[PDB]
C-alpha cells in the first residue's frame, strides 16, 4: 500500500532485525550439523611427503601424498590408508 | 564471473565402524590445473571508473 503525505525519520545501523538474522542462522547452522556423523579418532600422528607431478604443473604447490593408521570396524584391528591433504590442512610438530 | 575446478579427482569411502561411513580423498587422474576465475576486463575497468567518480 502506497502512503500519502507522510514523512518519517530513518536510521540503519541500529535496526534490531539484523541481529535476529544473525542469531538464527547460527542456531540453524549447528542444528543442521549436529545429529549427523561425529569423528574424534582421526587426528593421529602422520608422516607425509608431496605428490610426484605436483612439480609438473602450473600449480607447483602442495598436495602431500600421505598415510596413517586408523581404527577399523573391529576394535582389535588397524588398517593402512593412503590419501591427500593440502598444505592449509596440515602442519608439523617441532627422521621423517 | 566464471569459476571452475579442473581436476575431477575420484573418491573412495571406508568404514570407521560401527556405522560411520567416512569419506576421504582418492586419486588424481589427468593433468593438474589449480583453481581460478575469469572476469571481463573492460567492464571491470568501466565500473571502477564509475565508482571513483
Amino acid at each position: 500500500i502506497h502512503l500519502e503525505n507522510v514523512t518519517e525519520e530513518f536510521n540503519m545501523w541500529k535496526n534490531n532485525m539484523v541481529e535476529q538474522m544473525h542469531e538464527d542462522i547460527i542456531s540453524l547452522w549447528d542444528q543442521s550439523l549436529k545429529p549427523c556423523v561425529k569423528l574424534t579418532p582421526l587426528c593421529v600422528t602422520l608422516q607425509c611427503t608431496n605428490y610426484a607431478p605436483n612439480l609438473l604443473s602450473n600449480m607447483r604447490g602442495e598436495l602431500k601424498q600421505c598415510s596413517f593408521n586408523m581404527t577399523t570396524e573391529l576394535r582389535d584391528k588397524k588398517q593402512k590408508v593412503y590419501s591427500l591433504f593440502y598444505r592449509l590442512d596440515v602442519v608439523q610438530i617441532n627422521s621423517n | 564471473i566464471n569459476c571452475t575446478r579442473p581436476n575431477n579427482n575420484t573418491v573412495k569411502s571406508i568404514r570407521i565402524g560401527p556405522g560411520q561411513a567416512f569419506y576421504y580423498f582418492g586419486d588424481i587422474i589427468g593433468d593438474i590445473r589449480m583453481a581460478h576465475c575469469n572476469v571481463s576486463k573492460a567492464t571491470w575497468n568501466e565500473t571502477l571508473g564509475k565508482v571513483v567518480k
Partner: antibody, heavy 121, light 111 residues
Framework: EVQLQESGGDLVKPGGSLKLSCAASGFTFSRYGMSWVRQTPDKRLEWVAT????????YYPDSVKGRFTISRDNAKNTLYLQMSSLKSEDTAMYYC??????????????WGQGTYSHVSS | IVMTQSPASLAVSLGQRATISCKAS??????????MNWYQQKPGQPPKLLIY???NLESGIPARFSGSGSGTDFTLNIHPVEEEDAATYYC?????????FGAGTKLELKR
C-alpha cells in the same frame, strides 16, 4: 616391466630432419610421465624431460631451444620426437624412461633401451 | 647451473666401507627437501635406481646399504660389499627447474 622398443638411424649432416620414435609397454600409458636421456662419453649425458597428458612443458632444458619438439599420443600408446637443425657436440638420442609415483622430486624407475647413432660425416 | 662434487674414481679393498659425497651443487633446499636419488650403471647394463625418495632402501634390491642426508651436505655409506657392487654411481639431487648431475664414480675392488 616391459621395456621400450626404439629406432634410431641418426647419420645426417647437420639438417635435423630426423624422426625418432618410442614404443608402448604392458603397463598403462596414461597417468604418468616420461623423459629422455642421451649418451655422451662420460659427461652426465642429457636432461630432457616431458609431460603427462597435456602437461605444461615442451622444452625441458635450455640450449635445445627451437630444436626439441616432443609430442605424445595417447591413442596408440606411443610417443616420438623430432630434433630439427642438429648441432655438433651431439651423438644421438638414447634412452626412454618413466617418472612414476610415490617418489619425491622425480625418478627414472624404468629404462627402455639405448640407441647409438653417430650423426656426422 | 650447479657445482657437483665427487672425490675421484674410487677403489675398495673389500673392507665394507666406501663413502663418497656430493656436498652442494647449489644453495640449500626447503622443508620438503626434495633431493633425488642415486643411479647406478655398468658398461653391460642401462642405468638403474639404488635408493628412492631421498631416504630409504628400494623394494627390489636386498637390504645391505643406505645413505645419509641432511639439508644440503651429505654422503653415502655401504655395508659388507661383494662382486657386483663395484660400479659407477651418479649423484642427481636437484629438482626445481632443471634436472642436473655432474658427479659420478668409478669404483673397483683392489686386487
Amino acid at each position: 616391466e616391459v621395456q621400450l622398443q626404439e629406432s634410431g638411424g641418426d647419420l645426417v649432416k647437420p639438417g635435423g630432419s630426423l624422426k625418432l620414435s618410442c614404443a608402448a609397454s604392458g603397463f598403462t600409458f596414461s597417468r604418468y610421465g616420461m623423459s629422455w636421456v642421451r649418451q655422451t662419453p662420460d659427461k652426465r649425458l642429457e636432461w630432457v624431460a616431458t609431460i603427462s597428458s597435456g602437461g605444461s612443458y615442451t622444452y625441458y632444458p635450455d640450449s635445445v631451444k627451437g630444436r626439441f619438439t616432443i609430442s605424445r599420443d595417447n591413442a596408440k600408446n606411443t610417443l616420438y620426437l623430432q630434433m630439427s637443425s642438429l648441432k655438433s657436440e651431439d651423438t644421438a638420442m638414447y634412452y626412454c624412461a618413466r617418472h612414476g609415483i610415490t617418489t619425491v622430486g622425480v625418478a627414472m624407475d624404468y629404462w627402455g633401451q639405448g640407441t647409438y647413432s653417430h650423426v656426422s660425416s | 647451473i650447479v657445482m657437483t662434487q665427487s672425490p675421484a674414481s674410487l677403489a675398495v679393498s673389500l673392507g665394507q666401507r666406501a663413502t663418497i659425497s656430493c656436498k652442494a651443487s647449489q644453495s640449500v633446499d626447503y622443508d620438503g627437501d626434495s633431493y633425488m636419488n642415486w643411479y647406478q650403471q655398468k658398461p653391460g647394463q642401462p642405468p638403474k635406481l639404488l635408493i628412492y625418495a631421498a631416504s630409504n632402501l628400494e623394494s627390489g634390491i636386498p637390504a645391505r646399504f643406505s645413505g645419509s642426508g641432511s639439508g644440503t651436505d651429505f654422503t653415502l655409506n655401504i655395508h659388507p660389499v661383494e662382486e657386483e657392487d663395484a660400479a659407477t654411481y651418479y649423484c642427481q639431487q636437484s629438482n626445481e627447474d632443471p634436472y642436473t648431475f655432474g658427479a659420478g664414480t668409478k669404483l673397483e675392488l683392489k686386487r
